[PDB]
Amino acid sequence: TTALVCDNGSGLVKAGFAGDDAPRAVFPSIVGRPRHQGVMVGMGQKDSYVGDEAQSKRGILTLKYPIEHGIITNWDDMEKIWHHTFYNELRVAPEEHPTLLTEAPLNPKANREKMTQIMFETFNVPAMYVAIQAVLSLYASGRTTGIVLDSGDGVTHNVPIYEGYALPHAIMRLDLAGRDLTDYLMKILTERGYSFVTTAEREIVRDIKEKLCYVALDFENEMATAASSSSLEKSYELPDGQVITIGNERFRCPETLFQPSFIGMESAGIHETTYNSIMKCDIDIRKDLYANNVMSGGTTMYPGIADRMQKEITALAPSTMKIKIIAPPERKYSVWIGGSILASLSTFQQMWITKQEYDEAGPSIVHRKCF
Amino acid sequence: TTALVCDNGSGLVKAGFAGDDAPRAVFPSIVGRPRHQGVMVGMGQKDSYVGDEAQSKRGILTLKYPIEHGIITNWDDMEKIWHHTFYNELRVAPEEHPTLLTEAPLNPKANREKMTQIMFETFNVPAMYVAIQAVLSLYASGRTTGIVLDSGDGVTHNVPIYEGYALPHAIMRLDLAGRDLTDYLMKILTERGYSFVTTAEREIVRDIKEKLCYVALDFENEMATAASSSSLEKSYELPDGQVITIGNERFRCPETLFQPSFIGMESAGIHETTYNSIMKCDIDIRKDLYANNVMSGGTTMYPGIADRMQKEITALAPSTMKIKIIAPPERKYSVWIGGSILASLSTFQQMWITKQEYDEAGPSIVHRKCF
Amino acid sequence: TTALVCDNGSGLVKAGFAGDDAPRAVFPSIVGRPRHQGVMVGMGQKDSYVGDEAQSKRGILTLKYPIEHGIITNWDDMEKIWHHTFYNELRVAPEEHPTLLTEAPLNPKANREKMTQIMFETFNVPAMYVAIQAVLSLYASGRTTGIVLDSGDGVTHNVPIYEGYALPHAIMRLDLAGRDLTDYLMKILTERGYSFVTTAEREIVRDIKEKLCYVALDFENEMATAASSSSLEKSYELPDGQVITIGNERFRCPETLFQPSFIGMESAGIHETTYNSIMKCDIDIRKDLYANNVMSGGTTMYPGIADRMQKEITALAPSTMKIKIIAPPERKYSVWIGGSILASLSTFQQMWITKQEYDEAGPSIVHRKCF
Amino acid sequence: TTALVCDNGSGLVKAGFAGDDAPRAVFPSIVGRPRHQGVMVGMGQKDSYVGDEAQSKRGILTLKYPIEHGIITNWDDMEKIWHHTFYNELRVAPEEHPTLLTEAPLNPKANREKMTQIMFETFNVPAMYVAIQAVLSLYASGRTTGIVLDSGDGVTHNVPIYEGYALPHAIMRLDLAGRDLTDYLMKILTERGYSFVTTAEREIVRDIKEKLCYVALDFENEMATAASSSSLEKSYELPDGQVITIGNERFRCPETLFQPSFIGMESAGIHETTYNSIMKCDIDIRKDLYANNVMSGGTTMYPGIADRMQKEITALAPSTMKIKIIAPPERKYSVWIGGSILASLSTFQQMWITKQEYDEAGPSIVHRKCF
Amino acid sequence: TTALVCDNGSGLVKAGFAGDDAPRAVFPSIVGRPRHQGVMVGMGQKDSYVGDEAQSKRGILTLKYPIEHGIITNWDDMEKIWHHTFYNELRVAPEEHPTLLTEAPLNPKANREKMTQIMFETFNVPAMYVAIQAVLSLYASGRTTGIVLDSGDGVTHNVPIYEGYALPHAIMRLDLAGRDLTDYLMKILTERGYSFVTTAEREIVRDIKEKLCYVALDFENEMATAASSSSLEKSYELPDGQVITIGNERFRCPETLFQPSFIGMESAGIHETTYNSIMKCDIDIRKDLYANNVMSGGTTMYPGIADRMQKEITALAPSTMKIKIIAPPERKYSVWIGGSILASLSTFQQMWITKQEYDEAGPSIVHRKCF
């Protein structure tokens, strides 16, 4: 019949039917209340703005993100986003089609149980599933081996997979993603005197970094060139028509991926975290993981991120190993296309968690993995 | 049934029923006592002249204005003007029809409380409301976005509105208006030897500026042309039949709008005040305000005021922004037609402050804004 | 070398060199033609009488005043008065010494331009200046702060000054002065049956008020005492030897200063005009103006005018403010001594309008104020 | 020898030698031009008034503040203030003594580079340093741990410090300070009809809030008491001698500290910002920060601000934590006394940026932090 | 004279003189560098924190462990820990007293040679020895037979001993210890949403498991009780004052001892490893080993670990064998007290490796075992 695949993670909700080549719905997943004055409810001024209208009428709204570090925080408000996706954006009657929800690894169980209970209680979904983003992201390439390095707006995580088996003892999760690169760019742009404070202005810095930034191949040489010369400097126009000149900051923001120290995060970068998750694995595997290192999600679409990563992990692993980094076009949709394949896969149809089965067996059903 | 809308501000009282295309009553709102001799009360010489009779029999009267800078000063005398409006000019029995009164922003609370208490105590109005002139002025265009630049005889003020929301943190109010341009013209006309002193003669200079004056597109070029040549000079006939020649003064009076320094007022002009009230607003809004800059009220009917304003704000804001200044015909009635629409609007009928509700909840009721 | 200072205002021409303690020339500034019969010109009967001879041979002459409300009206006749001052009274050759002319504020520009053009055209003055009487009047005290309340025969005006700066937005000018008090006394003396009609008889009432009148401290008590008793009555001898008894009228004439309604003038008195010109000024100044309120000119030499004024403004201003009214002796010469100081002041010598400079730059030169 | 410490921030310049117990110079740091008329430069009327003379002769001057939100805006005019401090107020020859300048955190680099370049170029300071106000403010207590909550006229900021180490990843900066509380009081005082407009009148509201205001312990109870009763009302005398009655407004102005929504600022209050900057820090630290929460600067001298703050953060943090707020007397001088200690500290003498070192190494020297 | 015994293994350094009943020094053996900012070395901020100060000032430090799996990794940093132990903690002059160092079995020879070379080169120890922890642990009981099951922070190992002879062909070593149980608890506590990431937070989970955890007698029954009921749940307070509720996790962490599969370790548990090391031994011995099964070290102090172990090995070995598990109090000090006895034993004094003997015979001396 149909299946509805939703990348439910932080930032863009991607949703729309399986059996299609691209998402049908993509919208920022923000919720906004009128800031300046209490709502003129007697005249019917709508007090909630979710998804697209919020960004369209950004300046008057307290834009809240209801998913923070991949953990759903506001349950009253996340349900408004699902409400909007099914009834307004897709215009699909949700009681009729199964829904494949997706999650980060190593989340609190309570978040999966609430997310399930709502879908069975208020939307009355007929059948449902919660998958892990890094596994779906692999089907999108057609491969059955690789270390899926998945970035995002909220959570970065690695899931090595081999011969279709999933290794659950070497999943890694960082808390480093586009929201932390945005909160860093908002701090390094004040060195030029541009000062963004409110959430609406954050939704402008979240657009600067999308276009202007690029990953410096060698960070310590570009910190020379950006000091001696101004061919690196580039200019961008704000909504009001004022022009920014962004210069040096243009490549320091993605650098924090590789140096989490910059943001105060005591961690390995993403290059040391892929390498650690490989070294943790058995010695027999590693020559196959090095050859199949797949990337997905935004904050892995900066120009040249692959060409740096491959050099930077090459500097760690032995020189007898060829290292190829599979960064296909449309990484932004990798997880959704993985859902659009896996939901149409003829073997999968036994894994759906039928509403009846949850109603009788109780919420612990959701943690089963008879995959 | 009906609603009575009154522009109660300084200068012309505009009044007459909602559901009509134009005011039914327009009269100068002056009060006058016989000056020269104490009134022959035993013979019944009427000692008060309000509205039209005062201007008709101007020369013998001490014309007082009971509203000064939008603040009602004489409570004994303002009530004579409402008395005259309801009983003599409209000939409407006021106990029967709700009345929508209008106010400047940032007025003292005490002025709204007295104005309410009189309407409920002596006129016994059945239901009443006090609105802000710059919000009503926007409905008159049908728009739901724009920076309402409202001039007048007493108070100039800006109210940006967006998507029907009102931003109350960026209302600005100046104290610069037709009464200050009149008091300036009375001072620059003495350079030609015409000297107007009494209030009756002020009600002649208040008519000179209405007809003779115009806004110079470029002030510093016209101060050349008016020096080298006399095509700029123009002539006007007084009530007694003597002819004035007004020359250079003809365009210096509206110039004080843009240069409040001229009148001793330490302020931005109206071009810097619209621009400041825009810059104060959030960056996301500003491209929409620049496109919807609405004007209202007299002292915004001088020929070419729009065509200067648009150049003068264009000189401030970025050159990527189109700036359109919406100065419709009948700016003089914009606020009244806004009242004639808003009072007939089907959603508004819950906002009336019923007499019973004020009688029980006490005068603090008038500051509520469940709009 | 020298400078010639002239109080050119209405009534007494005061003239004579700077660097002296008192005017050298003081004379009534009247012009007179033989009234009764056309002049016996073939026998050489002199048809013009200016200054002192006119008053000396008053009774046969149509005494005209060539300055009316501080505006020069007869240009053919005012030039006779300057002619007489330089050649006959001072006996000074005017081509040789600079002349500091003085003016009322808010005069028509044309009056300053004609007054300049004559001095450069017919007298061929080498260098010249036109100052404002109320500024000069302040130097006479040595102060650099105060509200200069300047009376006169023609024009009353206020000029607040502070720290040597002049505030040009709070100059006030009334049209109320000794000529209007004379024309009022000529009307209230007919209540006793004395009737003065001709201009010569006006030059007698202008001498009655100088001696007999005084300012009543409390007007409404003296209108009692003058009704119940006759210690207030006083007697004066006319030129022919007839005795007047002036009684009640003795203090009603200066009262019109404080109540311009009496003369049909719709105005604040001088006590409300000083107070209005203070209230107009910035709040930071006012405690300094109240302490430095200077008086000058005749019609401010009536006995007790200061002691009333100080009570009458004390009744307006707040009771925390000390109010001191600086009425020095020789108020009549205050403006002239101010000229005799300012013309000898070493900084001033750059402000002279050299004849060459007017000849080349044209009559608009006279309005410059690089003071 | 000596060291000159200057709190260069917005509002009061505090300056005077290290090794003393209190500033030797304290003056408002305003610059003023004569407003009403263009300066009589040929007579030598001084056209600039900085520091004390400006406030002394307030009413005639366009008081500009050359530091706005801690960012120096007018470079031509700020240099007049340093000129006045060194040559006129301290009468110290600046080529001879090192100067410790102080700054807000997160300022634009360009502001530090200009501020340095001027001190080395025009004053020719022999050696100089730019420190951060919140670090110096801690030495003033003698502590080596605490969350320095520093308010001011321009910028509020938090700097947690622990064991003498500075954590640079949890500095927070708001744009909320005495200038915004003044601009709010000027808006809420119009509810009583007092209307202050010009900058001179702002320098009176900036004195009202200093004396009359106090922080309400419980805002929502005092909004009851101020409604039912008038023991809360208090009265104050203006320079002219008129008395204000300030009532309800008396405690709503400091409330905006805790509720930035009131001023249109979308932010946490200062109570949520200290708590956020603590929660951001590592879990091991927090019990030590709660015990050492230091306050400094004006707008942290309102009566009872500490006793509210301690309750309001106690409502957030866990109840097992004792919270002590160290608000010593002379918070106004905390930063200056910190400079007077740190500039005399024997270890510091290697951190001075010698003029030679800047001349050779170039302006990037100023961002080094070999602290 | 004296002898200095040091448990040099991972986690707590235990040190202090032989001939005493308990260690004199016990401290975490961590090394820490300031994380957040490069050290202010010119001011003398100490850049190294070892032992107790590191844990005391935990939150600002990158806590590194210099011993990893019983192998010394950082030679520059381990020497700082010996430096601190001898000079600061014991305050003993090390050139004067022999030192008995202790080691895991089956270590790389290079680790013993470096450890020896440092003690003879930089500390200049007069005489020294490296013993094996599991042999010393037996003397602590006074027994001369038993299978010493020694746990720790780094290495678990078995050494069967019989009649004082050591069997070197049945030493077993696992890589499973308190550091792996900590890294597992940090992963299972995220199921409740508590997420510990940094090393400082690891030093809090390393304290949770010390107090809250206990060994479930029957794991599969307690996984029932913890599902049906909440008497098992227990609560603990963090340093900041926030309370954890730990529940189910409380007994799954020590379970990984018995099921190394849980941590991804392909191994027998400790119950199968004691049993394998017994079965490997000759049939004549085994009835004596079963009766003398001694435990030592932390991660063998969890409540009830003995009472489970004895049941779980009883399930393997024949039912004719009595099995007694000798878990005395103060297992944490067993190895140190074994050193404090063996170093005072009169026969041992010939086994010291004199400095002279190493200087002449070369580093291969350290592997001799003329025991």
Ligand SMILES: Nc1ncnc2c1ncn2[C@@H]1O[C@H](COP(=O)(O)OP(=O)(O)O)[C@@H](O)[C@H]1O
């Ligand atoms: N073309 C791009 N270049 C750089 N960054 C991008 C680009 N597109 C999106 N991003 C950023 O990547 C982040 C995550 O996007 P996305 O992968 O859609 O999140 P999720 O996968 O959780 O929906 C967002 O901050 C987004 O702005």
Ligand SMILES: Nc1ncnc2c1ncn2[C@@H]1O[C@H](COP(=O)(O)OP(=O)(O)O)[C@@H](O)[C@H]1O
């Ligand atoms: N056609 C005109 N041209 C110029 N000025 C005008 C014109 N009509 C009115 N004005 C002046 O505008 C001022 C305000 O008029 P109005 O807008 O009616 O005041 P309000 O809106 O407060 O009633 C008055 O001084 C009036 O004389």
Ligand SMILES: Nc1ncnc2c1ncn2[C@@H]1O[C@H](COP(=O)(O)OP(=O)(O)O)[C@@H](O)[C@H]1O
């Ligand atoms: N002693 C006096 N008492 C009252 N009024 C006087 C006295 N002297 C002069 N006046 C009147 O004051 C008027 C103005 O005189 P004056 O100040 O000389 O005029 P101006 O200053 O314009 O020359 C004249 O009417 C004069 O008669």
Ligand SMILES: Nc1ncnc2c1ncn2[C@@H]1O[C@H](COP(=O)(O)OP(=O)(O)O)[C@@H](O)[C@H]1O
């Ligand atoms: N006693 C006081 N009570 C309340 N506010 C004060 C007091 N003294 C000063 N202020 C206000 O605090 C603000 C900042 O003062 P200050 O701390 O000197 O600024 P800075 O530290 O930047 O020099 C000013 O607006 C000042 O008026």
Ligand SMILES: Nc1ncnc2c1ncn2[C@@H]1O[C@H](COP(=O)(O)OP(=O)(O)O)[C@@H](O)[C@H]1O
């Ligand atoms: N009372 C206890 N209960 C449970 N575990 C403990 C206890 N005390 C210590 N541990 C843990 O045992 C581990 C090893 O401690 P220890 O035996 O001192 O190591 P070593 O013997 O190598 O010095 C450490 O992780 C320690 O936290």
Ligand SMILES: [Mg+2]
């Ligand atoms: Mg994603």
Ligand SMILES: [Mg+2]
């Ligand atoms: Mg109007």
Ligand SMILES: [Mg+2]
């Ligand atoms: Mg005079």
Ligand SMILES: [Mg+2]
């Ligand atoms: Mg400060």
Ligand SMILES: [Mg+2]
């Ligand atoms: Mg041990």
